[model samples]
Target: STASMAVEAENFNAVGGTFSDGQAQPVSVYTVNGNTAINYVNQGDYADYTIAVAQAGNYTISYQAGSGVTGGSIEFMVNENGSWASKTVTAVPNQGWDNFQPLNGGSVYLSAGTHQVRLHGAGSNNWQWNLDKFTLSN
Candidate 1:
């Protein structure tokens, strides 16, 4: 069974209350769905995908794919209340599954009042994994 993971600004670890069938904490903010999440064709399938919530201001996203070396890719974006600013992640390849990459938290900026950040799969390769989490902080 595969479900998606989501995060809000207040408690970087709170997976929110949105239930995609599993129990409240069945999966954290990020869950693994058959090496791929359900809202797909693939990852980042929708605007609500791997979304940002609650508080917001210059936040960053940290995610992981399932397969090692066979790991997949992830792209992040800065979405202000109604407009997407830009794609933040750059020069990325599929990082091995369960292997945290680059840095502690790949940080990005957002608005302060409230906003949404988004993510997407690399493309074509078909690698997959559980995106551990993204931290929103100053």
Candidate 2:
């Protein structure tokens, strides 16, 4: 059987690169409207998460996100056998930082095992979007 899995954005296992927020702070979590989320994301920044799939199948990924501006995009990647497999990017619409909504990404197949999933900021502009959580459903 297959099941849907959700992970909070602040629960990242690791992060990559730096931010353009002047402070150069590493990926940080903050509270937006009482919800803890990953904030201040910029192009070239990425966060990694550990996920265990219950079954081998294709899964549709979605992100609960909000942005100060439009045109921000997120690229999803999965690590398989020491290599990164790229999934399609999801474009985020302008919904204000405090207003969150779900943005769907392309589907990727996963084996029934643990994998490292990455959320990469592939936006064209700075200050990508605040992520509340990400979900995968087969």
Candidate 3:
């Protein structure tokens, strides 16, 4: 088996954005991996997730993320106080909002405990960035 785990996007704490929806209400954008995902993210917005870890080390991170338009980006951070690994992951728009795909591919070092991860719009080319879930593996 693979030493991997999945975290729903709605599970993360919304650090910013008000006109956003979680796994509630009727969502047009479909998620195959999870029940629901997050939509409607704007500039100066970010989300934080506190995930439990069994061991401490480096882990590869991938996302089931989406974008409404091209020329946008999402920033990723780990361990709350950890450095920003993927400074600005370009948001490549698919066919539609439900058209989710893996993005922001990168890895980071985490401690053997509950850690905080974050995703936000790039300070520069910020736009509507949607994320369904994220996966962590060796």
Candidate 4:
């Protein structure tokens, strides 16, 4: 099924997060809703996205995630107002690197109008993961 609400990885603002080879690291052919996905997403790295909430309410945040290594997880910190804080969620390694899966977690209250959303890696900086896209829905 197609995502009711989503933001592509490339759509994030270029202020934070490391871009491999001077740009977002590319992923091979995979099952993603979009053609673009980013890598080198380590601790202290974050991506920003500007979204316009049509209605004021709560929405669950889901991600297309993957990890190459096992026994490690990527924790994300979501900020609804570009403050770069709060709404923590952890995504476990599904199975393989290129083996992407949909991980739905957490919820946030958003207001109408344009708002900035920042998703950042939290805790230890040694995890390697691929972020394809993020979807939001009530």
Cα lDDT tens digits, model 2, 1-138, are 567988999999888766657544557788866889988788788999999887888888888988888768888998877998888798888879768898887788888889999999888877787899988898
Instruction: State each model's CA lDDT, in order.
Output: 0.40, 0.84, 0.65, 0.62
Stretch of 10 with least lDDT, candidate 4: 21-30
Off by over 4 Å in 2: 22-24
| Each prediction's TM-score versus the true structure | 0.46, 0.91, 0.73, 0.74
Which stretches in model 1 have alpha-carbon errors above 4 Å? 1-57, 64-66, 69-71, 81-83, 90-105
Error of 3 at 53 (Å): 1.0
Writing each residue's lDDT as its tens digit, candidate 4 over 16-128 gives: 54434344332222344554676666655666677887877777888877777643344444454445556646655647656668876578777667777766655453555
lDDT of 1: 0.40
Model 3 lowest lDDT segment of ten: 23-32
TM value for model 1: 0.46
Residues 1-138, candidate 3: write the lDDT tens digits: 236778888776546653345534312234445547766666556777788888776777788777667655666776445554453355556555667877756677666788777777664434566778888886
Error of 2 at 88 (Å): 1.7
Task: Sort all candidates by lDDT, best to worst.
Answer: 2, 3, 4, 1
Question: Alpha carbon lDDT of residue 43, candidate 3?
Answer: 58
Stretches of candidate 4 exceeding 4 Å from the true structure: 1-3, 15-35, 70-82
CA-only RMSD, every prediction: 9.6, 1.6, 4.6, 4.5
Task: Sort all candidates by TM-score, best to worst.
Answer: 2, 4, 3, 1
